[PDB]
Amino acid sequence: GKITLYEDRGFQGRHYECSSDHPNLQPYLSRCNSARVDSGCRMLYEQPNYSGLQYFLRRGDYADHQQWMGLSDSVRSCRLIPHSGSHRIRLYEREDYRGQMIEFTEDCSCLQDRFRFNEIHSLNVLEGSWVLYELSNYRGRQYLLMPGDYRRYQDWGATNARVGSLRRVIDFS
């Protein structure tokens, strides 16, 4: 579904509508302080080409960048996160799919209660899209994880391997 991004808060000012991924919004927004997500979850990125801080958005009207927990009004690229009927993800202790491992099909608010490691060094997203969080309780930096192979933590754009919680990307009905 469509997302409309607005330069000013409260859905005011210069705006830009897009139906899918966009690697560089710099030409259409110099800043972003509000957004309307019609349907279909989005990940917003502070920097072009899907880097910088990431923020997860389900459908809804966001009148201020703080409504998506944005630390700033920089939105320079965006992904449409594909809907999925099921979710499956394998997490490994070590790089390149080695060490202790654990597989999830549901959300988990404290990874360490279930898996005695503070870090995840590789993972395989078998079905669905997920959001991984630096800390437990869905706190800290956010990382979008779509289907695919992730042999080291850099492959999900993180600067370290800390992971404390994870959630399946599911839009409201």
DSSP annotation of 157 reads: T
Tell me the C-alpha distance between 4 and 29, whole Å. 11
What is the side-by-side order of every strand in the sheet holding 122-127?
98-104, 88-94, 122-127, 148-150
CATH code of the domain occupying 1-83: 2.60.20.10
How was this structure determined? It was done by: X-ray
Tokens 């080409």 sit at which residue?
Answer: 49
DSSP annotation of 159 reads: S
Tell me the C-alpha distance between 148 and 139, whole Å. 24
CB 77 within 8 A of CB 166: no
Widest CA span in the chain: 52
Structure-block tokens of residue 77 = 């690229």
Dihedral sign for Cα atoms in the order 56, 60, 62, 66: negative
What is the side-by-side order of every strand in the sheet holding 60-62?
12-18, 3-8, 34-37, 60-62
Query: CA end-to-end span of the chain, whole Å?
Result: 13
CATH number 2.60.20.10 is the correct assignment for the domain at 84-173: yes
In the chain, where does the domain assigned CATH 2.60.20.10 lie?
A: 1-83, 84-173
